[PDB]
Write a protein that binds this ligand. Structure first.
Ligand SMILES: CC(C)CCC[C@@H](C)CCC[C@@H](C)CCC[C@@H](C)CCOC[C@@H](CO)OCC[C@H](C)CCC[C@H](C)CCC[C@H](C)CCCC(C)C
Ligand SMILES: CC(C)CCC[C@@H](C)CCC[C@@H](C)CCC[C@@H](C)CCOC[C@@H](CO)OCC[C@H](C)CCC[C@H](C)CCC[C@H](C)CCCC(C)C
Ligand SMILES: CC(C)CCC[C@@H](C)CCC[C@@H](C)CCC[C@@H](C)CCOC[C@@H](CO)OCC[C@H](C)CCC[C@H](C)CCC[C@H](C)CCCC(C)C
Ligand SMILES: CC(C)CCC[C@@H](C)CCC[C@@H](C)CCC[C@@H](C)CCOC[C@@H](CO)OCC[C@H](C)CCC[C@H](C)CCC[C@H](C)CCCC(C)C
Ligand SMILES: CC(C)CCC[C@@H](C)CCC[C@@H](C)CCC[C@@H](C)CCOC[C@@H](CO)OCC[C@H](C)CCC[C@H](C)CCC[C@H](C)CCCC(C)C
Ligand SMILES: CC(C)CCC[C@@H](C)CCC[C@@H](C)CCC[C@@H](C)CCOC[C@@H](CO)OCC[C@H](C)CCC[C@H](C)CCC[C@H](C)CCCC(C)C
Ligand SMILES: *C/C=C(C)/C=C/C=C(C)/C=C/C1=C(C)CCCC1(C)C
Ligand SMILES: *C/C=C(C)/C=C/C=C(C)/C=C/C1=C(C)CCCC1(C)C
Ligand SMILES: *C/C=C(C)/C=C/C=C(C)/C=C/C1=C(C)CCCC1(C)C
Ligand SMILES: CCCCCCCCCCCCCCC
Ligand SMILES: CCCCCCCCCCCCCCC
Ligand SMILES: CCCCCCCCCCCCCCC
Ligand SMILES: CCCCCCCCCCCCCC
Ligand SMILES: CCCCCCCCCCCCCC
Ligand SMILES: CCCCCCCCCCCCCC
Ligand SMILES: CCCCCCCCCCCCC
Ligand SMILES: CCCCCCCCCCCCC
Ligand SMILES: CCCCCCCCCCCCC
Ligand SMILES: CCCCCCCCCCC
Ligand SMILES: CCCCCCCCCCC
Ligand SMILES: CCCCCCCCCCC
Ligand SMILES: CCCCCCCCCCC
Ligand SMILES: CCCCCCCCCC
Ligand SMILES: CCCCCCCCCC
Ligand SMILES: CCCCCCCCCC
Ligand SMILES: CCCCCCCCC
Ligand SMILES: CCCCCCCCC
Ligand SMILES: CCCCCCCCC
Ligand SMILES: CCCCCCCC
Ligand SMILES: CCCCCCCC
Ligand SMILES: CCCCCCCC
Ligand SMILES: CCCCCCCC
Ligand SMILES: CCCCCCCC
Ligand SMILES: CCCCCCCC
Ligand SMILES: CCCCCCCC
Ligand SMILES: CCCCCCCC
Ligand SMILES: CCCCCCCC
Lengths: 231, 231, 231
């Protein structure tokens, strides 16, 4: 395990996701409100899935070698397995907060699936120049998602409770900033142009992942917006 | 890319799915009705997914070699990845049109999953005679789906709005004819008996795919059946 | 096929799932009640999926070799493909019976996904001692599911119809006993410590699978709890 310099960040990531999972699990024990239960379920599952995939990367299972540029390049494929399930759960948290219509939710989840799926294909593609074609398609799917979060959701939040409108606005802003960093790190890291070494890349993704999951969850689950308006 | 004679049909397929995706995306921009949004979301996602998988076939990612009959046989596995997601979306379009009950929808999607999954296993099976066992099981799942579309849905459409009944009937008929061709092409093509060469097989699937997705979508999204009855 | 001593149990399993599938399919033909249709759909799909995966194991497709302990160890990976889809369907049968809230259903299905997914990783892991780390995480996800079935569902059933409360209690008890055997068989069988040989392991899983699917389904589909209260 320690044979890879990036192991320290995989281990820290595993620990922080594990701790985040346990914290949300305990916190949600005292919850009976049916609406709050939905948000706790979604939000606890996110770091639990990430915990398993960080562990698989730490132990070496979630790593494969991909030939491109005349080299055997270490590619952590387990990231995409994580993201396939956790990024639509994160979007679902946002969509339920603002009572999004079903068509909009399906558009978001579908675009998200395309985003992660094409990122996976790009990560595993052996023809170097083609990796960036997949990156571009994935990034276009991301831009669609960000567009919807701003010009379909923000003006939906404003007709809702003030506490859900303010909580949505904060989580929207956190999401757009954090999620936009992922394609940049991929592009300059070992999957793309290879300018930033894998150990630093792994650190960067770990900070983004913990912030986008445990950070996000801490903000959401401390808000009164997750509860039905009750006396 | 041009090293494979079937590349021209993969390229045309990619282009037509891409163009179809953009057309539906633009067309649905001016839509606020919650019901119509569902149909636009579902129907736009279908060629978008197909676009990505056609591209993966064009670039060579979605192709593998399978030993059977003492030969290395080129198998485009990306078709099944496409179909796994797009065929239940197509069925969902039909089921929502007639306000199908939840049990019926689950039966359809489940049978569809079995249909595509067993087709994939058959496509990748190395014992030649066993490929046709999987083809038979998949075809039985197809026949179940077609049965339900006729003797569970058609008489559901007739108690609904005339515009939804007439639109459903047309899309049902398009679906049954087009979908029934797929097992025949598989059986006589490079996956099955090998009587029709891969380049012609690829052409045939491209015509079926564009018709079943973009053709289907053009009929559906031009109907007033996708809108709630409103003043 | 007969080259593997466990083939007889794979063949019997295939037959019993096939027969169970046909029986439930015929039985549900005379059903119009929308609630009952849901239970028939879910419950018929379960042995149908299991039939396909038992067949893939019989024909040899669903088997791979995994190096650990200095040996090539036969691992039937198709079990996890089965279980990935059938165990959440089984939980859905239980959850719908007691009209579980959406948050609880998502927690169950999510924990179940983690349970099966980590079992799959453990089954395919090449470092022997690490296989048991994945077994432990999977078992913890199982224990969560069993906890919810007892201390979240049982007291939900009691405020419902007596026929649904009594049917739920029986199916809950069947589920907890049968499902708890699976991690034990894995641990002592060819995936784990290797004390029980593969042919006996295969027998054990076949008895558990038929009981947990066809047995379970026979109890559920003969109950009046699956019908809406109607005059
Ligand atoms: C009911 O609605 C609220 C339940 O949501 C909360 C439900 C949770 C989503 C349940 C899912 C967590 C499972 C219990 C997962 C089990 C293994 C976990 C990964 C635990 C890992 C952390 C520990 C090992 C440090
Ligand atoms: C509604 C939304 C969910 C829409 C989803 C959007 C989605 C369509 C976007 C594209 C997804 C698609 C790229 C998934 C591809 C998975 C694939 C990378 C798995 C690895 O297999 C690739 C090659 C080795 O590189 O296998 C070597 C050759 C092997 C023989 C491969 C044969 C097995 C195939 C992988 C079977 C395909 C199954 C499905 C792709 C399962 C989807 C997995 C998940 C990653 C989407
Ligand atoms: C809101 O409900 C309506 C939105 O549906 C319409 C929503 C669409 C389903 C959004 C999904 C499309 C994504 C934007 C996919 C991005 C890449 C596409 C494959 C674009 C490819 C076509 C172009 C490259 C020729
Ligand atoms: C409700 C509905 C959805 C019901 C669904 C119906 C469904 C049950 C029908 C059968 C689906 C099942 C056949 C999927 C099999 C996928 C498999 C072909 C992927 C390729 O792996 C096959 C061999 C190489 O040929 O791998 C070589 C050996 C490797 C070590 C394989 C180990 C990895 C396994 C593939 C893990 C299994 C994961 C699940 C099958 C994911 C499902 C993928 C999708 C195609 C259904
Ligand atoms: C409508 O709601 C009730 C339908 O549920 C019942 C619907 C069923 C879930 C339909 C799914 C079964 C498909 C017809 C599967 C076809 C192949 C089967 C595996 C048949 C195998 C058994 C036989 C070959 C012995
Ligand atoms: C809401 C709930 C559903 C939550 C779900 C919980 C879930 C997160 C729990 C963990 C699931 C995760 C372990 C699935 C891993 C599948 C993996 C074993 C498939 C086989 O690939 C493993 C190695 C060979 O051993 O591939 C060799 C290297 C290859 C290059 C691998 C590259 C292809 C990757 C497999 C692509 C990943 C796609 C997704 C994992 C699809 C999920 C399949 C299913 C088994 C969950
Ligand atoms: C918890 C993990 C999260 C929130 C991950 C988010 C990841 C993305 C938004 C990834 C986006 C990518 C692209 C837009 C193109 C390049 C490849 C990706 C997959 C890194
Ligand atoms: C957009 C793509 C569509 C509508 C594809 C439909 C495909 C089928 C109905 C495929 C059916 C098959 C069988 C019935 C058995 C042989 C294998 C298949 C998968 C080709
Ligand atoms: C129809 C099949 C059923 C009901 C299978 C149930 C399987 C399980 C509950 C498996 C549990 C496992 C663990 C808890 C850890 C070890 C690995 C598994 C996957 C066997
Ligand atoms: C969105 C953030 C992307 C920028 C990442 C900056 C990383 C700077 C680290 C120094 C680069 C290491 C190069 C020498 C090894
Ligand atoms: C459902 C349509 C299946 C029939 C396809 C007919 C294809 C005819 C093309 C000629 C066959 C090529 C054989 C000589 C290369
Ligand atoms: C939950 C049941 C697990 C116990 C399984 C008992 C199997 C006993 C069979 C005898 C073991 C075979 C060892 C000699 C080959
Ligand atoms: C490819 C995996 C996509 C599914 C991820 C799980 C999250 C799905 C959330 C469903 C949202 C509800 C839509 C109506
Ligand atoms: C194996 C992939 C199956 C899922 C495909 C996505 C479409 C699912 C549509 C869900 C229909 C709603 C059922 C209640
Ligand atoms: C990884 C596969 C998980 C999906 C299995 C299919 C069963 C899903 C049942 C959905 C229950 C409804 C939740 C709201
Ligand atoms: C186009 C929608 C406006 C809100 C999205 C902001 C786009 C940020 C760009 C992210 C950088 C990705 C490379
Ligand atoms: C049995 C249901 C009647 C409607 C379905 C028509 C079946 C068409 C056969 C398709 C050919 C597949 C090989
Ligand atoms: C902790 C919840 C109480 C009900 C679950 C009973 C646990 C049975 C243990 C199963 C054995 C697995 C190794
Ligand atoms: C070796 C790099 C070749 C450049 C490929 C860039 C493709 C980016 C596509 C953006 C439309
Ligand atoms: C080499 C071909 C052997 C014939 C197999 C046909 C099987 C079809 C099954 C239909 C019930
Ligand atoms: C070779 C076996 C080494 C023992 C591993 C047991 C790990 C079990 C983890 C339970 C917390
Ligand atoms: C990680 C295993 C958890 C089993 C005990 C249940 C914890 C309490 C959860 C309350 C919903
Ligand atoms: C509760 C702490 C969980 C941390 C387990 C994984 C950390 C890796 C240590 C090497
Ligand atoms: C908008 C046109 C999209 C076409 C891109 C793929 C066509 C392949 C050209 C070689
Ligand atoms: C209807 C009987 C189904 C049995 C088919 C599979 C049994 C395997 C026989 C070798
Ligand atoms: C993006 C950083 C999130 C910070 C989380 C802090 C949570 C405290 C309530
Ligand atoms: C099956 C062929 C479909 C033809 C689509 C034409 C759409 C015009 C409205
Ligand atoms: C766990 C054993 C189940 C027994 C099923 C018998 C069904 C008869 C109604
Ligand atoms: C990591 C366990 C958290 C302890 C409880 C925190 C207050 C709910
Ligand atoms: C008003 C919300 C500001 C949140 C910005 C957080 C940036 C990481
Ligand atoms: C809305 C601001 C987006 C900031 C992008 C930051 C990418 C590192
Ligand atoms: C391909 C872009 C379509 C242009 C608009 C067509 C009329 C909505
Ligand atoms: C009355 C509907 C006829 C549609 C037939 C289309 C055949 C491709
Ligand atoms: C309902 C008519 C079906 C026609 C099947 C055509 C197969 C090529
Ligand atoms: C296996 C076929 C079952 C025959 C009908 C049983 C009574 C519904
Ligand atoms: C009162 C229900 C008892 C069911 C026990 C079944 C054990 C297999
Ligand atoms: C509730 C009793 C569980 C029995 C476990 C049996 C495991 C073989």
């Amino acid at each position: 395990i320690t044979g890879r310099p990036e192991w320290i960040w995989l281990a820290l990531g595993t620990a922080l996701m594990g701790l985040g999972t346990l914290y949300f699990l305990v916190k949600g024990m005292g919850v009976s409100d049916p609406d709050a239960k939905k948000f706790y379920a979604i939000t606890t599952l996110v770091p639990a899935i990430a915990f398993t995939m960080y562990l698989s990367m730490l132990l070496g299972y979630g790593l494969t070698m991909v030939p491109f540029g005349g080299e055997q390049n270490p590619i952590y494929w387990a990231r995409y397995a994580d993201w396939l399930f956790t990024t639509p759960l994160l979007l679902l948290d946002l969509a339920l907060l603002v009572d999004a219509d079903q068509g909009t939710i399906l558009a978001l989840v579908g675009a998200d699936g395309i985003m992660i799926g094409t990122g996976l294909v790009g990560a595993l593609t052996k023809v170097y120049s083609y990796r960036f074609v997949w990156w571009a398609i994935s990034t276009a799917a991301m831009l669609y998602i960000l567009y919807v979060l701003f010009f379909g959701f923000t003006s939906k939040a404003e007709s809702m409770r003030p506490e859900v409108a303010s909580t949505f606005k904060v989580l929207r802003n956190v999401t757009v900033v954090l999620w936009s960093a992922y394609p940049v790190v991929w592009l300059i890291g070992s999957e793309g142009a290879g300018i930033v070494p894998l150990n630093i890349e792994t650190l960067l993704f770990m900070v983004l992942d913990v912030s986008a999951k445990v950070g996000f969850g801490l903000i959401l689950l401390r808000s009164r917006a997750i509860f039905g308006e009750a006396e």
